Amino acid sequence: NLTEEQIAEFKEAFALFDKDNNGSISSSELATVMRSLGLSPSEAEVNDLMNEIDVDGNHQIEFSEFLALMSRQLKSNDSEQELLEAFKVFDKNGDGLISAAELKHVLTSIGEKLTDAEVDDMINIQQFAALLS
Amino acid sequence: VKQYYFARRGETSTHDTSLPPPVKVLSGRSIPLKEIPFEATRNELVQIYLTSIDKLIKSNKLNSIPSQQIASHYLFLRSLANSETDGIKKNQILSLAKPLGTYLASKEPHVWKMINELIEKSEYPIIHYLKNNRAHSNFMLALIHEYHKEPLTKNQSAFVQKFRDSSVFLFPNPIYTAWLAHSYDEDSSFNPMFRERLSTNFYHSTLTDNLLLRTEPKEVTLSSEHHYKKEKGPIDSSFRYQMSSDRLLRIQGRTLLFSTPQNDVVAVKVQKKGEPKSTLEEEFEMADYLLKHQRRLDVHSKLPQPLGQYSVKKSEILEISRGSLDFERFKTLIDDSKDLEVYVYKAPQSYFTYLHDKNQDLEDLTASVKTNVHDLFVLLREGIVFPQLADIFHTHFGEDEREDKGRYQALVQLLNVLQFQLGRIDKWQKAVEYVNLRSSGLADLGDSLPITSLFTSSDFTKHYFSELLTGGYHPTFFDKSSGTANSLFTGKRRLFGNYLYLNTIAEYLLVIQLTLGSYGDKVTRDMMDKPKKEAVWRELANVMFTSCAEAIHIMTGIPQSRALTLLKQRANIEKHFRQTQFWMTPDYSKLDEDTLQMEQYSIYSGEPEYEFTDKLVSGVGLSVDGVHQDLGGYNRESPLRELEKLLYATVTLIEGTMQLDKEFFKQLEQVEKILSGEIKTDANSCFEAVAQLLDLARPGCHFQKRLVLSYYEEAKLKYPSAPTDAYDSRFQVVARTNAAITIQRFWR
Numbered sequence: 001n002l003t004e005e006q007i008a009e010f011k012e013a014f015a016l017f018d019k020d021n022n023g024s025i026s027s028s029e030l031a032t033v034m035r036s037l038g039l040s041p042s043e044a045e046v047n048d049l050m051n052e053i054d055v056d057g058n059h060q061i062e063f064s065e066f067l068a069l070m071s072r073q074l075k076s077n078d079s080e081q082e083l084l085e086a087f088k089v090f091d092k093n094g095d096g097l098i099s100a101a102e103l104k105h106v107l108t109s110i111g112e113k114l115t116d117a118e119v120d121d122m123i124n125i126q127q128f129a130a131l132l133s
Numbered sequence: 134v135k136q137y138y139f140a141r142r143g144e145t146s147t148h149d150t151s152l153p154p155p156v157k158v159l160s161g162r163s164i165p166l167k168e169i170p171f172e173a174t175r176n177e178l179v180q181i182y183l184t185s186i187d188k189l190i191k192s193n194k195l196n197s198i199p200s201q202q203i204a205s206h207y208l209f210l211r212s213l214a215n216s217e218t219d220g221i222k223k224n225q226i227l228s229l230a231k232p233l234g235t236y237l238a239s240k241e242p243h244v245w246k247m248i249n250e251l252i253e254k255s256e257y258p259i260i261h262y263l264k265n266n267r268a269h270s271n272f273m274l275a276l277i278h279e280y281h282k283e284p285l286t287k288n289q290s291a292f293v294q295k296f297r298d299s300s301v302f303l304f305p306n307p308i309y310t311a312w313l314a315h316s317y318d319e320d321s322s323f324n325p326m327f328r329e330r331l332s333t334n335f336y337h338s339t340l341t342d343n344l345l346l347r348t349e350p351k352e353v354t355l356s357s358e359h360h361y362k363k364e365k366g367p368i369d370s371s372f373r374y375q376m377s378s379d380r381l382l383r384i385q386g387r388t389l390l391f392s393t394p395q396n397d398v399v400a401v402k403v404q405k406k407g408e409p410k411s412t413l414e415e416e417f418e419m420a421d422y423l424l425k426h427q428r429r430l431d432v433h434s435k436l437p438q439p440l441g442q443y444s445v446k447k448s449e450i451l452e453i454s455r456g457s458l459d460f461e462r463f464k465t466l467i468d469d470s471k472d473l474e475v476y477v478y479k480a481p482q483s484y485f486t487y488l489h490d491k492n493q494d495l496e497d498l499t500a501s502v503k504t505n506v507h508d509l510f511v512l513l514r515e516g517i518v519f520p521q522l523a524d525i526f527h528t529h530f531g532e533d534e535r536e537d538k539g540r541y542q543a544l545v546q547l548l549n550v551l552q553f554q555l556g557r558i559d560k561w562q563k564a565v566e567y568v569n570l571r572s573s574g575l576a577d578l579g580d581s582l583p584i585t586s587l588f589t590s591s592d593f594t595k596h597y598f599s600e601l602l603t604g605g606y607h608p609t610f611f612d613k614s615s616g617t618a619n620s621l622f623t624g625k626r627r628l629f630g631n632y633l634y635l636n637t638i639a640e641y642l643l644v645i646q647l648t649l650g651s652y653g654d655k656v657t658r659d660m661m662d663k664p665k666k667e668a669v670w671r672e673l674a675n676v677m678f679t680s681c682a683e684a685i686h687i688m689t690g691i692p693q694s695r696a697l698t699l700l701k702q703r704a705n706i707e708k709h710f711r712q713t714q715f716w717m718t719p720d721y722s723k724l725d726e727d728t729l730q731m732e733q734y735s736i737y738s739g740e741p742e743y744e745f746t747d748k749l750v751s752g753v754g755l756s757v758d759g760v761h762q763d764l765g766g767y768n769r770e771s772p773l774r775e776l777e778k779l780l781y782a783t784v785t786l787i788e789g790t791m792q793l794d795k796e797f798f799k800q801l802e803q804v805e806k807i808l809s810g811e812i813k814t815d816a817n818s819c820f821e822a823v824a825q826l827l828d829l830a831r832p833g834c835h836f837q838k839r840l841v842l843s844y845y846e847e848a849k850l851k852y853p854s855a856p857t858d859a860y861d862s863r864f865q866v867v868a869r870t871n872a873a874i875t876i877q878r879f880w881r
């Protein structure tokens with residue numbers, strides 16, 4: 001139950017890591033895929049995932065199951081903290097403040113561009129991330 | 134429900150198994166056909182180029198060649214070195230390049246500044262320097278001709294003749310595949326076309342052939358539970374269907390259509406003149422297979438419900454059909470015998486509406502096209518090919534004695550020697566008149582072929598693609614010293630399955646195109662609103678482009694919207710709309726010389742006009758039979774030039790992405806072995822391997838670059854003393870973009 005941009009990334013990553021294109025991926029590549037999706041699990045969670053996937057004795061993950069795993073893994077993240085680390089990329093001197101003019105440039109120029117109006121309902125990092133969530 | 138395919142794709146050593154022998158028989162004399170090896174010959178030419186660079190440096194003639202060509206040489210040598218593992222060869226290449234670099238930073242220092250901007254962006258900076266019409270300046274060949282003062286071998290001469298259009302055809306595999314992939318990116322103005330003494334050279338098909346000749350032979354394995362593998366015993370048709378003349382609705386072909394109380398349709402398919410029973414049992418079993426697996430495969434078509442397969446007395450069939458006004462024509466199709474096999478099934482009314490039916494509004498057409506395109510390509514992934522969706526022929530004049538049997542080849546340039554353009558389509562609207570694409574989805578499912586029959590010397594492939602399976606002959610290929618005819622084409626015996634796989638993809642989309650055009654002509658023929666006619670043709674162009682992007686999405690996982698952007702870098706939807714509307718309607722038959730030229734200028738813009746000597750037929754246009762319109766004049770090419778570019782762009786994006794992914798994971802395995810310790814080497818080598826993986830990521834695919842950035846962070850932690858000034862810029866770009874993504878997505 002995520003955004004369309006996230007689902008699209010999930011579908012292409014699944015497709016890319018489906019080497020022989022039979023519609024399922026080996027659990028052996030689950031670690032690399034999750035890494036590419038910016039939500040690599042802990043060495044404990046991945047073991048719990050390998051054991052959780054080994055219950056039925058099928059180590060081929062089809063997209064329905066794959067989406068379920070990514071969904072709860074992504075939800076097993078601190079949204080406030082992830083956003084914090086994001087702003088922390090545009091603070092190079094390390095003082096805890098990012099430029100305002102810079103944030104407006106990147107979010108409308110690169111990535112999944114936001115439109116000027118949507119960024120204008122959106123500087124102090126620790127605080128900004130704190131109150132946006 | 135678990136959604137996945139009963140088909141698996143990998144690689145094998147060769148397709149050249151149980152093929153016709155590589156021999157051409159000419160007037161009783163058997164001429165053996167030999168392959169010219171692609172990779173070995175390519176490498177020989179690059180070696181000669183390197184020795185030519187050596188002579189250029191010694192000659193101190195560098196002052197005499199334009200700066201853009203010096204930059205190309207330098208950037209290519211730097212890209213070549215970075216792709217060369219052997220440290221001796223690598224340093225040999227870097228030594229040949231240093232004199233050029235020394236020269237540039239002194240006499241052409243603004244060009245030198247740009248060179249380092251690209252070097253700081255990529256490990257194969259030559260690919261970004263040739264994202265434009267510089268790719269048409271064949272600097273490598275020009276250097277070889279100026280400094281290699283001796284003849285080329287026959288193999289080499291044959292290579293450069295086929296691949297004269299651009300230096301990229303000499304690049305080693307990863308650099309070519311990466312160049313080809315990024316040449317579609319949004320900062321690329323590269324178009325495989327340049328002008329030649331007023332004559333225009335189109336070499337889009339050459340891009341695909343240079344790619345395919347580098348690939349490994351593919352292999353498809355079907356699961357044991359697959360329709361073509363699992364042993365499903367004889368059909369148990371305990372149930373019969375009582376035909377009543379009062380319920381008969383109409384006849385289409387050999388199929389009796391009966392009404393039901395539920396307002397769907399019961400259909401009785403009756404044996405053709407020379408149709409075996411198997412053809413009817415096969416359609417029954419395929420329908421049952423697709424209904425059973427409809428959820429697994431996410432088949433969107435409204436599938437027919439198979440009911441029975443049993444024998445019926447002719448006399449009974451003739452008694453119930455004798456009312457309909459199709460009676461006489463139906464009698465001519467059914468088998469003469471008095472005991473006729475039949476196939477009974479139930480289907481909605483929309484199953485009998487052909488996808489070109491002019492009574493559909495544009496919104497219903499679009500949805501039905503999407504369903505057909507979807508199912509065609511998911512079922513291709515399932516390992517099922519439909520080679521008889523339509524009856525597209527290039528010609529009927531020499532039909533039986535033609536190697537191609539007159540059947541149209543959507544990628545003819547790749548499947549034959551010295552064929553440069555898609556040819557005339559004979560009676561193009563008639564080809565799709567009874568197309569097996571319907572308002573409801575797919576139909577006529579028993580005329581199917583396992584995908585593996587395209588990778589072997591099946592009856593199908595032997596009948597229609599004998600030239601490709603046998604080899605290339607042309608008088609210019611004859612080597613009198615050996616008495617053999619040599620060509621790069623004969624090398625395709627080993628890879629021909631890869632070629633037919635892509636031809637199937639282009640053929641499906643050609644069927645879609647003709648179906649759309651048949652709809653377009655019929656719905657706009659009696660329209661008096663002229664701007665509205667154009668709007669329909671405009672939207673049909675959108676639907677075609679969208680269908681091509683959907684096919685790419687289904688075969689590669691590339692998001693549909695990016696696939697469309699990639700296609701539109703290469704194919705011009707405006708030209709396509711103008712060309713389809715112009716040539717697929719009869720209006721042009723009413724024009725004279727000066728008006729035709731002006732109209733042609735508008736639909737080809739800068740490119741050459743379509744030339745023909747044919748005498749147009751009034752109210753039809755180009756027509757060999759004087760009744761049905763053709764696409765193209767006699768013995769000439771199809772005028773739908775942008776369509777050809779679009780089909781090649783589609784299959785080149787599919788195949789090029791498949792090979793790009795293969796290079797990406799080869800390099801990824803290498804990066805992970807360096808980061809783990811399996812391969813112990815210095816920090817710069819580690820940084821280089823990771824930077825190269827960045828070059829092998831899909832254009833526009835961020836998560837791939839996120840992964841590569843993560844490898845780069847890990848690499849910096851593994852070599853914490855190593856200077857990283859030469860790589861931080863490009864990865865900081867990825868880092869800031871990545872950070873932007875997370876912020877953007879949270880707001881959503």
Ligand SMILES: Nc1ncnc2c1ncn2[C@@H]1O[C@H](COP(=O)(O)O)[C@@H](O)[C@H]1O
Binds near residue numbers: 539
């Ligand atoms: N089977 C085919 N499918 C599509 N185009 C063809 C086919 N055979 C020939 N052509 C093209 O038609 C033109 C001449 O055909 P031909 O009459 O076979 O010499 C050239 O543009 C050929 O590339």
Ligand SMILES: [Ca+2]
Binds near residue numbers: 020021023024025026
């Ligand atoms: Ca798989």
Ligand SMILES: [Ca+2]
Binds near residue numbers: 098
């Ligand atoms: Ca700061």
Ligand SMILES: [Mg+2]
Binds near residue numbers: 388485
């Ligand atoms: Mg039918």
Ligand SMILES: [Mg+2]
Binds near residue numbers: 528530531768
């Ligand atoms: Mg002919």
Ligand SMILES: [Mg+2]
Binds near residue numbers: 386567
């Ligand atoms: Mg029909």
Ligand SMILES: [Mg+2]
Binds near residue numbers: 577580
């Ligand atoms: Mg049929």
Ligand code: NA
Binds near residue numbers: 020689
């Ligand atoms: Na795949």
Ligand code: NA
Binds near residue numbers: 556767
């Ligand atoms: Na012809």
